[PDB]
Structure 1
């Protein structure tokens, strides 16, 4: 039993909700919140901008130190950093950004990072400003993640389309 509320169960291990991941994180304080990161951990917009703003820029400060030490992530890769006031940990995961020309086949690799964590709150990787089809992102998630994932979809209209079209 966990503290997530109001989710629709899609499969054994995947759950979904129309919600703002920032407000959802601030209420559940999950062990792991997933950020829709880029390789530079520059949290400017989209989910990353909203998560970082909610931490009063502490996420960005921590991230800049991480990059200065380790260099950029790989597309499809991840790193674990602090969750600040939102969660115990933040798993920064780099989905391919279609608006940069990155290979959508890397979306599966990106979701594989979730399997290193028993339970996660997450957005749909590569959705929104990363330019991928969210219906495809949800499909890859369901077919790749084996751990317990609670997906937050900010747009109420998009959520209903994902549910009604889910196979």
Structure 2
């Protein structure tokens, strides 16, 4: 039993809610919140910008130190950093950005990072301003992640579209 509430059950381990992932993190304070990052951990917009703004830019400061030490992530890769005021940890996961011309087959590799954590709050990777089809992202999620994932979808109309088309 965990403190996630109001989520619609999609499968054995995947649950979904029409919610702001930032507001859900502040309420639940989960062990792991997933950020939809880029390889440089530049959290300017989208989920990343929203999470980072909610940390008062502390996420960006920590991320810049991480990159200065380790260099960029791989597309499909991840790193664990602090969750600041939002969660114990933030798992920064790089899904392919179709608008940048990156390989969509890397979406499965990106979701595999979730399997290293028992319970996560997460967005649909590569969706939104990353340019992939969210119906596809949800399918890859359900077919790849085996741990317990609580998906937050900001767009009300997309949430309804995702539920009603889910096989």
> Which TM bucket (shorter chain)?
over 0.9
Spell out structure 1 runs of 4+ moving beyond 6 A.
none
Deviations 1:107-136 (A, max 9, x none): 000000000000000000000000000000
Paired residues, number: 167
TM-aligned CA deviation for residue 47 of structure 1: 0.3
Q: For residues 114 and 61 of structure 1, what CA distance do their matches in structure 2 show? A: 24
TM-score by length of 1: 1.00
Deviations 1:32-88 (A, max 9, x none): 000000000000000000000000000000000000000000000000000000000
Q: For residues 76 and 59 of structure 1, what CA distance do their matches in structure 2 show? A: 20
User: Which secondary structure state, in structure 2, belongs to the residue aligned with residue 80 of structure 1?
Assistant: strand
Q: Which residue is equivalent to 2:121?
A: 121
Q: Which residue is equivalent to 1:50?
A: 50
Q: For residues 129 and 161 of structure 1, what CA distance do their matches in structure 2 show? A: 17
Please say if 1:86 is aligned against 2:76: no
CA-based RMSD of the aligned residues comes to 0.2
Q: For residues 109 and 23 of structure 1, what CA distance do their matches in structure 2 show? A: 27
Q: For residues 78 and 155 of structure 2, what CA distance do their matches in structure 1 show? A: 25
TM-score by length of 2: 1.00
Q: For residues 21 and 107 of structure 2, what CA distance do their matches in structure 1 show? A: 20
Give ranges in structure 1 of 5+ residues lacking alignment.
none
User: Which secondary structure state, in structure 1, belongs to the residue aligned with residue 36 of structure 2?
Assistant: strand
User: Which secondary structure state, in structure 2, belongs to the residue aligned with residue 91 of structure 1?
Assistant: strand
User: Which secondary structure state, in structure 2, belongs to the residue aligned with residue 39 of structure 1?
Assistant: coil
Give ranges in structure 2 of 5+ residues lacking alignment.
none
